[PDB]
């Protein structure tokens, strides 16, 4: 039962990220945090499979995905900062001017 | 020679460090029968598990 | 059982990430999730990844999130909303994902039911692979820089983009 | 399929992989390599092994 | 082997208990500064640099010249980024 | 590091040297290789000069353009010379020099 | 050892040149002596030069790109298909850069880092085209995506640009996570990430009753990421907002190059791999949805940029019809449609960039253009009629294959939808012609004449659009060649 | 495993005593430099002063200001104290004298160091005081800045050793102590340790007289004591790490029978004591940098030099094939 238990752990993390997207319509910072949660779940999926399959490819890609997660968070938080600086607020009603 | 006053707390610190080493070393030795071996790898663990059988079943 | 404990801690901490009213609290719970993940990694024997998750996710990424969220001083009125009216939409979407995606491995990876017999004696030991065991660290390092070096360098390019973008978007030189 | 094992030796399922690949490299119909393919996938997931052992456990629970 | 991590967990539990005892016995008797974000970004980058250094450092005996120069190229890219940050004033706190 | 120069598409001309050394490839540079090299470098220097006038850095811009052109032109000449020695490009001169030395 | 790297000479050169330009720009932009000169145009010219030299290196070394293929096999795969894809990508990047100089100097966008980020994204897309493993594909996609996130937010004091960036980063990161999940499921189910290994494992079985749900959902999630990238409905709504809110040169660049790169990826993953009818049905349903929604939403638009965004969504629906029918002619038609759509989009955005010097925003702002600039109004009218697919303009090729694929595969509902959406598209395209030629507004907007770069690019693309179907043989042959090279 | 808690206590309790007496030793040495006596009334030669101060602290009423972060405010000192304690699980005092013989011990120490910042950050934010928050932000930035140089120096040692095992790092110095060829690296490491522990000349939280409030200004009773104890335990740990990496840990100065008579734990202790004395001496000798100056030093001086030493050591060892 080990492999099903390790996989459902990562799976609950992924579903939690999805739920965080669904439940945070006024809070886009938490939406970013939910996306990181999904990325963490995928990283865990690669590591578990590497062990289960006795193969190193899952481990190389896990490290590279960590690099991508870091760069993603850096750029995303920069964009958050400049949006806040322009508006003085992070409320979603001030980032809805592009439409139609 | 008054400066020797300052060497007492430092000596106490050094003795404390010696205790943190030696007390944990002797407790482990008493419990396991031999001192801790640095670098216990898969081979050593397999050796100990097989040696349990080779001893007890003799 | 131990995986039940760690998964329960991760479940609760993740719910706290997505449901805490204060975003600083969300960042702190996120840190608890990464600690639990590191515990799982230690169970898998991947101590390098277990430590790196602490160093990078908690030591660098979460610190960045905490610095940014703390200086924002978000008022709850700007991000508050009642979530009782989402229970149905989360129920279908969660259930469908639950029914499909927690059980996707079941048909391919059928679990071994633990029997009332000692199967431990059927574990076969090959001592040949135990003469010179490799750490997780050296197994990874045998591959990153020679056989898959191009992907390594592309990741470096990704980090360079991050540095440039951080400067160009936020810098206001005094 | 890569062959790099997590402990620094040949991966567990790599010889099965290579037999399957070598078969498919000259058999114009993949149905001729079905047996080797299912051997590779059995090495990855142990599905039939665990199913058979669960049958044994089931019969034990039925006769008790 | 992961055996050596168990004493660390028991050590953590004991240290936590000592902390609670010490802390609990006395109960008986709006100015955003971007430079912090920037230093966080720089720390993130060099944190990943150290991360990638670790396997390389333990693997130098096996990867030989090819691994050395591949890591050198990695460092060259990251150091060009560092030079960019230096010139732009990201390293000045005045 | 195990290496294998073997290409997917085989050479259509006689193979004078399967994996020519760097210095051998450079010494194999012909007059046409030098013409390509010099043309690419000169165009690059010209672009650097002309694009540098408005910012006021025409000299340094010439140097930057010239560095880009030098590297690109050398890479192009090396590409041609190595491809000729390997039989991927028409290599009458290489074959003639090979059948004699 | 050195000769092994002949397979990556183009990429080495462009990366090194990008580093040189980064150093040049940062050293002289900070120079008090030179009074902090703007270097966006200087670096732009040097980077256009670098792109052209990269194109020369790649085009002239066709066989050498396949050298040492066994050594490079676990990193990438270069062939005839990647050859032509990468040439077309470099040509598009060069054109987009050439269209940026008036924007640099008249707006005074002085940031040279814009050019560096464009060049790094071009490096990423080059590696995307040659990717032959899920890991390499993901890494190259992420490099490209991060560069776009940064450049979409380049007007960092603008509400519109910051909004675009924020929406892009959030939705892009979400879709990337979904795709990575799919990749993890496929690896866990097959033990492989290399495209050759995946082809061997998946071929001959598709859904033979005992189907790997892990393999089936990994494919689905990867397809969702791909569809987000090509702005296919229902994963499209990021595209109109990002296209409108980004700086117009960014919008022009995003409209062309990523499509080339990601379709290269889609061909080599799906077409070269094997789950099968399920995935062609995915692209079938998304094509129909994209055509319908693009037509209707474009009909609703009053602004030029949003109209072009929705037009591109509809056209990717038309293109994906070719991927769906799963034949050599389908692939060829998809490639022909990408080439022609790219040249038409380049023409349209050259006009838009020319008009942005007087801040064109609304379709009604084009009023009386046939009076204030007759040859410009005609040129823009040719582009619109080509977008509408009126023969014998180049745009007629996509309409012709849309109906060619429906009638033969038996798809009468698709033909119905194509007829309706083509008529709707023609209406909202000729509305622009009516605005420039038929209307008599009380207030006119007089536009500043375009620069030489855009006039030359417009002149060449306008001859191509009018005259392509007189001599279409080279495109037809080159695209048949590429379609065949995917499997042989 | 039943005897493991005894070993853990035999580590933790003498460490707490050692910290209590490190405070006294700092006071004594500082006084003697200043031509005064320092504590010499409370107990003979002032040796009972730490017990009296600790007793006073436990008998002090806690304040717990009316903040909205009631839990976080008390948990921050617990976090920093526990992190200071747990690094000692992998520290070897002699051959075989170590609680956890981690193969990944070097990276584990780096991880603990990286975790140390959260106690300070949370104390600053939770205290509901703009001065504490600003001071905590500055201190956190300084620690993360010098962590980069610490990590790169760690990599230099790792290149020399080829293993993350601390005991292996010690035994790799049997031929020569790493502090001899890498002496500038050792100087860099000691300075970075000063900055990482918020110690003079880098002690921003001690600069109240400079209008720079510390992160722990709102703390009283045992939360403040926990912060103080964690800081001094970290000073002892940094001295121990300097000893392990560059002075050959428990090894004798010379491989001779006369030196091999005295136990390795005593060698290790003496080297640690030298480094603690240098901590105190430096605090006694110099004024402090401003925040901006020390940040400039962290990013502009120590990072480039650490990276250069990484490159030079690796290149030299690869060239002549002297790698482990
Ligand atoms: C202010 C206050 C003041 C007061 C106070 O507090 C502060 O002040 C404080 C100051 C404290 C003292 C500080 C220090 C010691 C020394 C310790 O005693 C030596 C430690 C024991 C083990 O450690 C050694 O051994 C290691 C391994 O070799 C050495 O490693 C080598 O090798 C490494 C690898 O190559 C290299 O890397 C290293 O460099 C290299 O050195 C390591 O260095 C060395 O330490 C001594 O072992 C022996 O005992 C064994 C017993 O079994 C006997 O075994 C024999 O019998 C077996 C059975 O037949 C046979 O099987 C065996 O073959 C056969 O040998 C035998 O006699 C002999 O081995 C006894 C405790 C005491 C007095 C402390 C008492 C408490 C205090 C007074 C505190 C006090 C409270
Ligand atoms: C620096 C900062 C500070 C913070 C921090 O870092 C950062 O600090 C860091 C410090 C970290 C902790 C460090 C350490 C641990 C311990 C670990 O826990 C070990 C658990 C493993 C080891 O457990 C046993 O392992 C061996 C047995 O396996 C025992 O060996 C015997 O057996 C040998 C064989 O006969 C003999 O040969 C030997 O002679 C004989 O002795 C050995 O004694 C014993 O240890 C795994 O075990 C389980 O796994 C099994 C498989 O799944 C499960 O089996 C079950 O399922 C099967 C079907 O699947 C059924 O068939 C079975 O019937 C059915 O039972 C079952 O649940 C259970 O066994 C859990 C994680 C944790 C807490 C970490 C958390 C995170 C931190 C706090 C980090 C934290 C983040
Ligand atoms: C001026 O700078 C200074 C400080 O910062 C202001 C100090 O905190 C301190 C003193 C801080 C301490 C003495 C903390 C010492 C704490 C310990 C040794 C561990 C606990 C010791 C105790 C006597 C508490 C006993 C608690 C119990 C529940 C009794 C059962 C055991 C000094 C001496 C100082 O000079
Ligand atoms: C049959 C095709 C299918 C249907 C589509 C038709 C699309 C067009 C719609 C037809 C309705 C009427 C269209 C009226 C357009 C004719 C008027 C026109 O375009 O004249 C242009 C002429 O536009 C051109 O410049 C067209 C040039 C295209 C060149 C194509 C010829 C290629 C070979 C010729 C070689 C050179 C000339 C040889 C002899 C000297 C004048 O432009 P202005 O804006 O008025 O002024 C220009 C400025 N200045 C005069 C000072 C220079
Ligand atoms: C802060 C420091 C900056 C340093 C910047 C200078 C160095 C940057 C790296 C430049 C590339 C290498 C330049 C050094 C020339 C000497 C190379 C050499 O000595 O040849 C060796 C081979 O060296 C190499 O081939 C490694 C080249 C490193 C890769 C650099 C990347 C170049 C382009 C890669 C294209 C991929 C796309 C890039 C993605 C961004 C011979 O080794 P061997 O064949 O005998 O055996 C192999 C080995 O010993 C066993 O594993
Ligand atoms: C094909 C590309 C070849 C290299 C392009 C050079 C890159 C920089 C040149 C851009 C053009 C330029 O420099 O514009 C300036 C000046 O424009 C030029 O004079 C052209 C500069 C050189 C371009 C042509 C020279 C020969 C180029 C041959 C190929 C090299 C500024 O114009 P102005 O403000 O002085 O306008 C006032 C006047 O009324 C205009 O009508
Ligand atoms: C954009 C606007 C189009 C440009 C106008 C037309 C271009 C005509 C220039 C070529 C004339 C002379 C070519 C010289 C020549 O044959 O040498 C070859 C260079 O090819 C070349 O120069 C190849 C040019 C390819 C043009 C772009 C093709 C795009 C394909 C459309 C697909 C788009 C969808 C992507 C998802 C290399 O020699 P060789 O023949 O040995 O090399 C291939 C072997 N296999
Ligand atoms: C008015 C009368 C017609 C109303 C619509 C008829 C719907 C039924 C058509 C149908 O059976 O659809 C099948 C699937 O086509 C499809 O593609 C499914 C229907 C279209 C789905 C995508 C469009 C949804 C709407 C988008 C805009 C609105 C957005 C939401 C507000 C066609 O069968 P086949 O063509 O596969 O047969 C291939 C044979 N060789
Ligand atoms: C196929 C259908 C039929 C096509 C017809 C083919 C005929 C060939 C074309 C013949 C061209 C006729 C004119 C030649 C003489 C003009 C020479 C240009 C003068 C020049 O140096 O221009 C500079 C600007 O560069 C420029 O203006 C050059 C850049 C122009 C953009 C085009 C190239 C961009 C890169 C490739 C794009 C590919 C896209 C395809 C996907 C400086 O101008 P100035 O001195 O007036 O000062 C402008 C203010 N700064
Ligand atoms: C990727 C590939 C993309 C390449 C795009 C292809 C060009 C696009 C066409 C748009 C403008 C071209 C004008 C059409 C030509 C009109 C007359 C056609 C014709 O017979 O001319 C021949 C071709 O001329 C030419 O070569 C036409 C001029 C080129 C512009 C010369 O006849 P020929 O006997 O020399 O050629 C053997 C075939 N008739
Ligand atoms: C490629 C591998 C590594 C890649 C990364 C590193 C690349 C190296 C760094 C490149 C960054 C750009 C360097 C620019 C140097 C400009 C120097 C300078 O100030 O020049 C002014 C300096 C003095 O002139 P002034 O500006 O009139 O005072 O030099 C010149 O302008 C010389 C002009 C004549 C040069 C023509 C020949 C050029 C051929 C190519 C060399």
Description:
Chain B: It comes from Arabidopsis thaliana. This is part of a larger assembly, with 8 protein chains of 8 kinds. Chain B is mainly α and 58 residues long. Chain B has 2 helices and no strands. In chain B, 76% of the residues lie in helices and 0% in strands. Chain C is mainly α and 174 residues long. Chain C starts with a helix and ends with a helix. Chain C contains 7 helices and no strands. Chain D contains 3 helices and no strands. With 64 residues, chain D is an all-alpha fold. In chain D, 61% of the residues lie in helices and 0% in strands. Chain D has helices at residues 14-24, 34-45, 47-62. In chain D, helix 1 (14-24) runs antiparallel to helix 2 (34-45). The chains are: A mainly alpha (100), B mainly alpha (58), C mainly alpha (174), D mainly alpha (64), E mainly alpha (94), F mainly alpha (101), G mainly alpha (488), H mainly alpha (324). Chain B binds chain C through residues 41-43, 46, and chain C through 125, 127, 130-131, 133. The structure holds ligand Q7G (2 copies), Ubiquinone-9, the ligand CCCCCCCCCCCCCCCCCC(=O)O[C@@H](COC(=O)CCCCCCCCCCCCCCC)COP(=O)(O)OCC[N+](C)(C)C, the ligand CCCCCCCCCCCCCCCCCC(=O)O[C@@H](COC(=O)CCCCCCCCCCCCCCC)COP(=O)(O)OC[C@H](O)CO (2 copies), phosphatidylethanolamine (4 copies) and 1,2-diacyl-glycerol-3-SN-phosphate. 1,2-diacyl-glycerol-3-SN-phosphate sits between chains F (45, 59-60, 62-64, 66-67, 70-71) and G (16, 19-20, 23-24).
List the SSEs and their pairings:
The structure is cut from a larger assembly and holds eight protein chains of eight kinds.
Chain A: H1 2-23, H2 28-52, H3 57-87
Helix pairs in contact in A: 1-2, 2-3
Chain C: H1 2-19, H2 23-43, H3 47-72, H4 87-101, H5 104-108, H6 136-144, H7 149-170
Chain H: H1 4-33, H2 49-58, H3 70-86, H4 105-115, H5 117-126, H6 130-161, H7 166-171, H8 183-196, H9 221-246, H10 257-260, H11 264-285, H12 291-320
The complex binds ligand Q7G (2 copies), Ubiquinone-9, ligand PC7, the ligand CCCCCCCCCCCCCCCCCC(=O)O[C@@H](COC(=O)CCCCCCCCCCCCCCC)COP(=O)(O)OC[C@H](O)CO (2 copies), phosphatidylethanolamine (PTY) (4 copies) and 1,2-diacyl-glycerol-3-SN-phosphate.
């Amino acid at each position: 039962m080990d492999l099903i238990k390790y996989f459902t752990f990562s799976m609950i993390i992924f579903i939690l990220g999805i739920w965080g997207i669904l439940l945070n319509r006024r809070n886009i910072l938490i939406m970013l945090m939910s996306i990181e949660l999904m990325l963490l779940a995928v990283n865990l999926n690669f590591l578990v499979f590497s062990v289960s399959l006795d193969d190193m490819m899952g481990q190389v890609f896990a490290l590279l995905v960590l690099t991508v997660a870091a760069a993603e968070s850096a750029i995303g938080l920069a964009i958050f900062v400049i949006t806040f600086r322009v508006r003085g607020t992070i409320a979603v009603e001030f980032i809805n001017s592009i439409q139609g | 020679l008054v400066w020797l006053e300052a060497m007492l707390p430092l000596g106490i610190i050094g003795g404390m460090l010696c205790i943190m080493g030696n007390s944990q070393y002797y407790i482990h030795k008493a419990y396991h029968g031999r001192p801790k071996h640095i670098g216990h790898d898969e081979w050593d663990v397999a050796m100990e598990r097989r040696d349990k059988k080779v001893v007890e079943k003799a | 059982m131990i995986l039940s404990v760690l998964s329960s801690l991760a479940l609760v901490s993740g719910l706290m990430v997505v449901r805490a009213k204060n975003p600083v609290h969300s960042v702190l719970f996120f840190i608890l999730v990464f600690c639990d993940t590191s515990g799982l990694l230690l169970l898998l024997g991947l101590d390098f990844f277990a430590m790196i998750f602490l160093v990078v996710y908690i030591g660098a990424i979460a610190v960045l999130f905490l610095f940014v969220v703390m200086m924002f001083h978000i008022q709850i009125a700007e991000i508050h909303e009642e979530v009782l009216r989402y229970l149905p939409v989360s129920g279908i979407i969660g259930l469908i994902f639950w029914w499909e995606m927690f059980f996707i491995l079941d048909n391919e990876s059928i679990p071994l039911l633990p029997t009332q017999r000692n199967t431990t004696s059927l574990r076969y030991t090959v001592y040949a692979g135990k003469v010179r065991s490799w750490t997780n660290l050296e197994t990874l390092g045998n591959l990153l820089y020679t056989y898959y070096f191009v992907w390594f360098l592309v990741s470096s390019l990704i980090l360079l983009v991050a540095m440039i973008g951080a400067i160009v978007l936020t810098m206001h030189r005094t | 399929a890569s062959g790099w094992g997590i402990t620094g030796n040949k991966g567990r399922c790599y010889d099965f992989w290579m037999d399957f690949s070598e078969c498919m490299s000259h058999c114009r119909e993949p149905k001729d390599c079905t047996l080797l393919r299912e051997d590779y996938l059995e090495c990855l997931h142990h599905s039939k092994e665990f199913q058979r052992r669960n049958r044994i456990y089931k019969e034990e629970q039925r006769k008790l | 082997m992961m055996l050596e991590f168990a004493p660390i967990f028991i050590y953590l539990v004991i240290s936590l208990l000592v902390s609670l005892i010490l802390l609990g016995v006395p109960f008986l008797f709006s100015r955003f500064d971007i430079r912090f974000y920037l230093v966080s970004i720089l720390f993130l980058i060099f944190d990943l640099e150290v991360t990638f250094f670790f396997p390389w450092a333990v693997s130098l005996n096996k990867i030989d010249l090819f691994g050395f120069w591949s890591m050198m190229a990695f460092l060259f890219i990251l150091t060009i980024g560092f030079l960019y940050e230096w010139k732009r004033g990201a390293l000045d706190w005045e | 590091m195990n290496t294998d120069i073997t290409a997917l598409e085989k050479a259509q001309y006689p193979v004078v040297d399967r994996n020519p050394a760097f210095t051998k490839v450079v010494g194999n540079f012909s007059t046409l290789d030098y013409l390509r090299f010099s043309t690419i470098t000169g165009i690059s220097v010209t672009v650097g000069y002309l694009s540098g006038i408005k910012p006021g850095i025409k000299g340094p811009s010439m140097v930057t353009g010239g560095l880009i052109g030098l590297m690109g032109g050398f890479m192009y000449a090396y590409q041609n010379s190595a491809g000729r020695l390997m039989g991927f490009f028409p290599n009458d001169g290489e074959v003639a020099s090979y059948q004699k030395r | 050892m050195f000769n092994l790297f002949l397979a990556v000479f183009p990429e080495i050169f462009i990366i090194n040149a990008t580093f040189i330009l980064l150093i040049h720009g940062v050293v002289f932009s900070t120079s008090k002596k030179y009074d902090y000169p703007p270097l966006a145009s200087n670096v732009g010219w040097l980077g256009l030069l670098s792109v052209l030299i990269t194109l020369l290196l790649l085009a002239a070394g066709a066989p050498l790109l396949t050298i040492a293929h066994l050594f490079w096999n676990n990193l990438f795969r270069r062939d005839n298909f990647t050859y032509f894809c990468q040439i077309f990508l470099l040509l598009s990047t060069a054109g987009t850069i050439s269209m940026c100089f008036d924007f640099f100097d008249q707006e005074r966008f002085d940031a040279f880092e814009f050019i560096v980020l464009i060049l790094l994204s071009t490096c990423g897309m080059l590696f995307m085209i040659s990717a032959y493993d899920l890991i390499a594909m993901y890494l190259a996609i992420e490099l490209q995506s991060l560069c776009f996130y940064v450049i979409a937010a380049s007007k960092r004091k603008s509400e519109f640009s910051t909004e675009a960036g924020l929406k892009y980063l959030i939705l892009g990161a979400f879709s990337s996570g979904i795709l990575l999940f799919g990749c993890s499921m496929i690896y866990g189910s097959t033990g492989a990430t290399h495209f050759d290994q995946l082809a061997k494992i998946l071929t001959g079985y598709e859904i033979t009753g005992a189907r790997s749900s892990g393999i089936f959902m990994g494919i689905l999630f990867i397809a969702v990421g791909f569809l987000f990238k090509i702005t296919a409905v229902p994963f499209h709504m990021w595209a109109p907002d990002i296209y409108e809110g980004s700086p117009t040169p960014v919008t022009a660049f995003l409209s062309i190059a990523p499509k080339i790169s990601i379709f290269a990826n889609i061909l080599r993953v799906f077409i070269y791999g094997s789950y099968g009818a399920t995935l062609q049905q995915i692209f079938f349903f998304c094509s129909i949805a994209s055509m319908i929604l693009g037509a209707l939403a474009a009909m609703a638009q009053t602004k030029v940029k949003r109209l072009l965004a929705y037009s591109s969504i509809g056209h990717v629906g038309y293109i994906c019809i070719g991927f769906s029918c799963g034949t050599i002619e389908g692939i060829q038609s998809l490639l022909i449609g990408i080439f022609i759509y790219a040249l038409m989009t380049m023409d349209a955005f050259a006009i838009v960039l020319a008009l942005r010097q007087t801040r064109v925003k609304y379709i009604a702002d084009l009023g009386a253009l046939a009076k204030t600039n007759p040859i410009l109004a005609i040129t823009f009218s040719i582009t619109m009629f080509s977008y509408a697919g009126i023969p014998p303009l180049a745009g007629f090729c996509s309409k012709f294959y849309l109906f060619f694929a429906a009638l033969g595969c038996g798809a009468y509902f698709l033909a119905l939808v194509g007829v309706v959406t083509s008529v709707i598209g023609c209406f909202y395209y000729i509305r622009l012609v009516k605005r420039m030629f038929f209307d008599t507004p009380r207030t006119w907007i007089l536009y500043e004449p375009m620069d030489r770069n855009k006039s030359l690019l417009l002149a060449m693309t306008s001859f191509f659009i009018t005259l392509f179907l007189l001599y279409p043989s080279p495109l037809f042959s080159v695209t048949h060649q590429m379609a065949l090279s995917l499997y042989l | 495993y039943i005897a493991v808690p005894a070993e853990i206590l035999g580590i933790i309790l003498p460490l707490l005593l050692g910290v209590a007496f490190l405070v006294l030793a700092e006071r004594k040495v500082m006084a003697f430099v200043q031509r005064r006596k320092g504590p010499d009334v409370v107990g003979s030669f002032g040796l009972l002063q730490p017990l009296a101060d600790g007793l006073k602290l436990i008998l002090k009423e806690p304040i717990s200001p009316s903040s909205a972060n009631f839990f976080l405010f008390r948990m921050a000192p617990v976090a920093t104290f526990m992190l200071s304690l747990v690094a000692w699980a992998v520290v070897p005092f002699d051959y075989g004298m170590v609680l956890s013989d981690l193969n990944i011990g070097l990276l584990y120490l780096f991880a603990i160091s990286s975790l140390g910042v959260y106690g300070i950050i949370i104390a600053g934010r939770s205290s509901n005081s703009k001065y504490a928050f600003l001071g905590a932000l500055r201190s956190a930035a300084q620690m993360v800045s010098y962590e980069v140089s610490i990590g790169l120096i760690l990599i230099t040692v790792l290149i020399c050793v080829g293993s993350c095992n601390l005991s292996e790092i010690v035994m790799a110095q049997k031929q020569i102590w790493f502090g001899i060829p890498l002496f500038p690296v050792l100087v860099m490491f000691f300075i970075s340790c000063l900055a990482e522990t918020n110690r003079a000349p880098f002690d921003l939280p001690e600069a109240e007289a400079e209008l720079v409030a510390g992160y722990n200004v709102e703390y009283s009773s045992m939360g403040f004591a926990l912060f103080f104890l964690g800081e001094y335990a970290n000073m002892i740990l940094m001295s121990g790490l300097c000893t392990l990496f560059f002075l050959g840990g428990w090894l004798p100065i010379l491989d001779l029978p006369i030196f091999k008579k005295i136990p390795g734990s005593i060698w290790f202790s003496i080297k640690v004591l030298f480094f603690l004395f240098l901590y105190i001496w430096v605090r006694a000798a110099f004024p402090r940098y401003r925040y901006d100056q020390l940040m400039g030093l962290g990013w502009k001086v120590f990072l480039p030099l650490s990276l250069a030493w990484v490159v030079s050591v690796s290149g030299l060892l690869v060239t002549f094939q002297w790698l482990p």
